[PDB]
From a paper:
The V3 loop of the HIV-1 envelope (Env) protein elicits a vigorous, but largely non-neutralizing antibody response directed to the V3-crown, whereas rare broadly neutralizing antibodies (bnAbs) target the V3-base.
Considering this similarity, the conformation of V3 bound to bnD.2 will hereinafter be referred to as Post-CCR5-V3. Noteworthy, we observed that the Post-CCR5-V3 conformation is occasionally sampled spontaneously, possibly promoting the interaction with either CCR5 or bnD.2. Despite different preferences for the Inter- or Post-CCR5-V3 conformation, the bnDs overlapped in their contact patterns, engaging mainly with R/H308, I309, P313, F317, and Y318. The R308 side chain engages via a salt bridge with bnD.1 and bnD.2. The bnDs make extensive contacts with Y318 and F317 which are exposed to opposite sides of the V3 loop in the Inter- and Post-CCR5-V3 conformations, due to the presence or absence of the helical turn. This enables bnD.2 to approach the V3-crown from the opposite side compared to bnD.1 and bnD.3, and to interact with several shared conserved contact residues on the V3-crown.
Author numbering:
A (entry chain B): 1 to 15
B (entry chain A): 11 to 139
Write the structure that this text describes.
Amino acid sequence: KSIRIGPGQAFYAXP
Amino acid sequence: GSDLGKKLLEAARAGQDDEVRILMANGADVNASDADVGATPLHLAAWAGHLEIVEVLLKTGADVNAVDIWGLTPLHLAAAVGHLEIVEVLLKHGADVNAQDKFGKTPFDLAIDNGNEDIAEVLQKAAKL
Ligand SMILES: [Ca+2]
């Protein structure tokens, strides 16, 4: 969750 | 034997490199895309830090510059998380250093924003060609 990726975090996180 | 593309997406995310090889031997589409967001196995392997899987997928024809619904490429994802060796392999296989996501951000921008200065330097040098 610490990775700054934007709205796509909803699919990839993960960190 | 059924739904090999969904299975390959899952195996790539999960780091199951033996299962990736099995699925591809049974015909799984290396360019399978998630039905809701368009991510490919290479996106997931690059984000999750699975170098062996990245290399298997590239060798079997994964599109290095595939985009998802947010405009993200595998290089964006590896640059954000900070996997230098994956960044280097993607660049060697033709990853587009100039690719912009839906917000205009390049892989360099994501490396900067995530404190991955060594990767940002690699990407800046590659953008000079
Ligand atoms: Ca750092």
